[PDB]
Design a protein around this ligand. Structure first.
Ligand SMILES: *[C@@H]1O[C@H](CO)[C@@H](O[C@@H]2O[C@H](CO)[C@@H](O[C@@H]3O[C@H](CO)[C@@H](O)[C@H](O)[C@H]3NC(C)=O)[C@H](O)[C@H]2NC(C)=O)[C@H](O)[C@H]1NC(C)=O
Ligand SMILES: *[C@@H]1O[C@H](CO)[C@@H](O[C@@H]2O[C@H](CO)[C@@H](O)[C@H](O)[C@H]2NC(C)=O)[C@H](O)[C@H]1NC(C)=O
Ligand SMILES: *[C@@H]1O[C@H](CO)[C@@H](O)[C@H](O)[C@H]1NC(C)=O
Ligand SMILES: *[C@@H]1O[C@H](CO)[C@@H](O)[C@H](O)[C@H]1NC(C)=O
Ligand SMILES: *[C@@H]1O[C@H](CO)[C@@H](O)[C@H](O)[C@H]1NC(C)=O
Ligand SMILES: *[C@@H]1O[C@H](CO)[C@@H](O)[C@H](O)[C@H]1NC(C)=O
Lengths: 144, 96, 48
């Protein structure tokens, strides 16, 4: 039950790949979330149309996702869960050090790392290794 | 009700207004009843996750991570109220 | 300096690494280990 005088209507949060901007410069604060949404009260669902030709990158020593501390995978949010505060956002950063740097010194509890066929001119973020060129797969954030 | 806000009720069994407010406008009106919140016991404002706590549970979260800058309570009479700041530790609670 | 755009290939039935009998991964040699004799070398062969 909500406060008073409510018809329980779930909100529909949508996403779409847009004509994005340039990949990021050298700073890990210099990656910009090119979407933002938030959860306030009641019910929600998340229309993810990002299974279309986007492979999932399995986590390992440096690159990939950092789904520890959030056991669910991104295509299983829509089942019955219980959160306390929720906000997801997409961001087009580098791939080898996106999540392993953007969880500790960053702004999310855990993040995922999808990939696609991207141009290999992407300035990665890490202490001392920020002078190379990497891939650019889209990485979603989730603040559980 | 006296004249001021559009609620029009002068009794108990009415509701409350936990509402956030930016510089010019208002949003997030939720109206919890005086039922389930019988008596004002405590009121916190926590740094991380920027969440605010009328006694016990949540009433409002948002995106940012912003520290408290001020607080204040109006009341005519009653018990002498207490202000206190705190740090973060681990604890465990027996509850039946 | 071979993390630059070089993916790691997870071991399976034919291709990939054969890291059994050496539990460490290549980017974790620099922590405190103890060997008895050690020699590494790179070589550009096939993959499968
Ligand atoms: C999902 O969104 C991605 C983010 O926009 C898209 O990736 C973009 O593709 C563009 C076309 O290949 C790239 O533009 C080129 O970028 C290079 C720099 O790497 C420039 O030199 C080129 O001039 C420029 N081409 C132009 C201006 O015509 C974007 O840089 C690139 N964005 C990235 C990698 O972050 C995906 O294509 C898109 N996928 C879809 C729609 O399926
Ligand atoms: C929360 O409640 C207040 C009630 O005061 C709403 O304020 C009204 O806002 C609209 C649009 O800005 C004005 O046209 C009305 O005149 C306001 N009512 C007043 C001043 O009594 C406010 O919009 C509500 N917040 C929501 C719905 O998000
Ligand atoms: C979108 O939300 C409305 C209520 O706001 C709901 O009626 C509708 O079914 C939703 N659309 C879906 C679930 O595709
Ligand atoms: C998600 O949105 C697309 C349009 O962008 C729509 O075609 C699709 O049905 C939606 N999926 C849902 C509601 O599950
Ligand atoms: C509480 O705030 C501190 C501030 O440094 C932060 O390090 C910690 O992760 C926060 N705890 C949470 C989010 O559970
Ligand atoms: C946090 O979420 C709000 C919700 O709209 C957004 O306006 C704000 O830019 C977000 N903060 C970021 C992305 O740092």
């Amino acid at each position: 039950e909500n406060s008073v005088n409510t018809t329980f209507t779930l909100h529909n949060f949508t996403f779409h790949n847009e004509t994005g901007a340039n990949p990021n410069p050298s700073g890990v604060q210099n990656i910009q979330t090119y979407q933002t949404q938030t959860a306030q009260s009641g019910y929600y669902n998340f229309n993810f149309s990002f299974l279309s030709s986007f492979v999932y990158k399995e986590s390992n020593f440096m690159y990939g996702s950092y789904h520890p501390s959030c056991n669910f995978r991104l295509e299983t949010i829509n089942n019955g869960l219980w959160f306390n505060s929720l906000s997801v956002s997409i961001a087009y950063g580098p791939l080898q050090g996106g999540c392993k740097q953007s969880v500790f010194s960053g702004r999310a509890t855990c993040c995922y790392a999808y990939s696609y066929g991207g141009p290999s001119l992407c300035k990665g973020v890490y202490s001392g290794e920020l002078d190379l060129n990497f891939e650019c797969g889209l990485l979603v954030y989730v603040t559980k | 009700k006296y004249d001021g806000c559009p609620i029009t009720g002068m009794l108990q069994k009415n509701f409350l207004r936990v509402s956030a407010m930016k510089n010019g406008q208002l949003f997030y009106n939720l109206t919890v009843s005086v039922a389930k919140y019988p008596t004002f016991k405590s009121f916190q404002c926590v740094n991380n996750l920027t969440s605010v706590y009328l006694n016990g549970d949540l009433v409002y979260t948002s995106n940012e991570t912003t520290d408290v800058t001020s607080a204040g309570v109006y009341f005519k009479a009653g018990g002498p109220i207490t202000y206190k700041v705190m740090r973060e530790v681990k604890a465990l609670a027996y509850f039946v």
